Amino acid sequence: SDVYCEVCEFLVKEVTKLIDNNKTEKEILDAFDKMCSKLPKSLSEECQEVVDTYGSSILSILLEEVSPELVCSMLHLC
Amino acid sequence: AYVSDVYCEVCEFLVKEVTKLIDNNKTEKEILDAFDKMCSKLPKSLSEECQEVVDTYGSSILSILLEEVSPELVCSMLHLC
What we know:
2 copies of one chain form a homodimer. The first copy, chain A, is mainly α. In chain A, 74% of the residues lie in helices and 0% in strands. In chain A, helix 2 (22-37) packs antiparallel against helix 3. The longest helix of chain A has 18 residues, at 2-19.
């Protein structure tokens, strides 16, 4: 059914721009660092550092690679 | 070269963590409300079928999306691997 495939593709694309907001990027980045406080000491002064340094870039790039057509195919909508 | 393996590995770890962190109750609810709002903006025909799809498959679109994220591919595109 081409209509359910279409709707599914709209849905997947909609998720992609919703995580893409800066409000979500901050929530996620803030919620990390906390994961790091579950450590040291030395391995929490380099966990925060690395989250800070690479995190923004990792987040926007993982969104870019999302295949709507693939998500929807593994649901059997497309 | 060994330092490059470290860079690549840290990037991959981050991709897996972040991926886990996105899958939470707040974010899932924001997605559902946005799905609902979006369906109601479509033409009558399509808005109803849009909602049917959200009702059955909506709450697991995020999980399949997160499952398809490739840490290696994200990090190669960053030139970290």
